[PDB]
Amino acid sequence: ASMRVLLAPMEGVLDSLVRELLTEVNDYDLCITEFVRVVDQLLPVKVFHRICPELQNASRTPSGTLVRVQLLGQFPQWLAENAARAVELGSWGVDLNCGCPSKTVNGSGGGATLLKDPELIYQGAKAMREAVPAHLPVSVKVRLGWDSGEKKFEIADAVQQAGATELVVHGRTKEQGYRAEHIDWQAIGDIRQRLNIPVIANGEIWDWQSAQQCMAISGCDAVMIGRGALNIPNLSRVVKYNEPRMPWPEVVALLQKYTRLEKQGDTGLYHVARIKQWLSYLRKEYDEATELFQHVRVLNNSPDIARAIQAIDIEKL
Template identity: 45%
Template sequence: MSPTPPRLILLAPMEGLLDFTLRDILTRVGGVDRCVSEFIRVTGTLLPERVFLRIVPELRHGGLTPAGVPVRPQLMGSDAACIAENAARVAGMGPHGVDLNFGCPAKVVNRHGGGAALLDEPETIARIISATRRAVPRPTPVSAKMRLGVRCDSRAIECAQAMADAGADEIVVHARTKLHGYKPPAYWERIDDIRRAVRVPVIANGEVWTPHEALRCLEVSGCDSLMLGRGMVSDPGLALAIRHPSHAGLTWEEMLPVFRQFWELVRVKIDRHARAGRLKQWLNYLRRRYPEAGEAYATVRTINDADLLCRHLFGELPPAEPTRDQLVTASVD
């Protein structure tokens, strides 16, 4: 019997990398059913709508990327009442759900009681989700993303049960602890333990770089859906290849116009000083899948001028710099 492809493939939130520009490009390639935004940090105040729009500009267009893929804003914090208040505000902007972050391993986040640090406090997790579920009108889903724990996975099931019992409609499990960071392997079998212990859908996440690993993850975890992060950034054709075994992914020749589209988007929507860095950042990830990306990265690694980098990568200077009016229009769009 042939392996069953996943029911859903989600694009993960990755702070400082998978912003609206890369979401746009990767969902154009295809195979992704839903995205989760970078976290929106909630620290004791009701955020104005412009903050949500800056991180999730798709909210201006029905919560969809230009390719029509839903984006679910993700909130992060430890104050249940404040998170609930902000969740209600962003829910009123028409997203296809609200997500809560209990998985970020960053030290600066965890020091302030956010992200994965809360996995030592299942009671706090329950309060946050319960308050958010009450504040967000149905049928808007409330989902959560977690790791297996902080230093060990002994409370993983307890945390997932707290989420489900408090009203989470869906849980994504990154199959590593905070202490593991992104070091392989991912412990997919522990996702299966969590999945068996809760009555809401569980989505598997962690260390999926190839179609074979995707199907193995589904088999071991018992899940029917996946979230892809670094694997999709490194191989933009991964979701398509997972869904369609006959699809070999994108060749480098097919990847080049995709990368060019990304440059054109970055050029219009990202501040000038950050553009070269964004291009080099994605090239660095693409090296894992494409030797040609490694060669290109070696050529431009030390170049910080966006125009010069464009000449090296594409053999030409970029078009004239966008006017202030064009940049304003782009930010509104």
């Protein structure tokens, strides 16, 4: 019966602005921030506030949905220091990225690179668990492996043995990328059966039926949705309650609200890039988004795209 739905971390997509917009019209149980890249220093407080403005609102979006800071990096001492800082600043626990393809800085790997030696996941997660007060959660997000799923149980074991609270599994290897035909929710179930912490299933959940299938196959009562949450802006309610997808006119209203939200540190091109990007996702689902994208793709500045989006009369749609 009960179902948890998490909004995925998405670097360069799901910032605080889009989290604000989406959580207002959804029932997400938790959102994950874009990653804070940890190398070999304690990051200043402003980095956390930039990535997670919700820290100044008791770790919640304006509508009240919890948000959790994610770290990306390798060195245990520095993951620990930065985890402690995230929670000192108010984060509801802390998450560790072990699934994103990521550039190594000097000797400091991160993300999917850690899947090549599961011990790196154990050491990083353990140092975070030890640094974060015991009542607050420490989560880890993984893929099934690097170039195969052969180490998928070692990866899962590393997270549990580190004392992590919960595990998100993206049901593909790194080398399988985002290829739909390679999703393996069964592998997620096999991991769940071995563990004693909640497993949150992730990958290729787009609608009510796909979530039902995912839960049935994996045995997980918790899922995480990333790209689908942009394609269908009310996807949490689609998945939880089998409600219809957000009508297009309400999608346009959402885009209009986005054009009126200010972005901290914006040089001037934020809305141009981000409205085009969101439309590039929406065209997978909404015919109308393909047409609107053709109209706005030629605009090269935020005021022009703001005027264009705002000009649309949603009562005429």
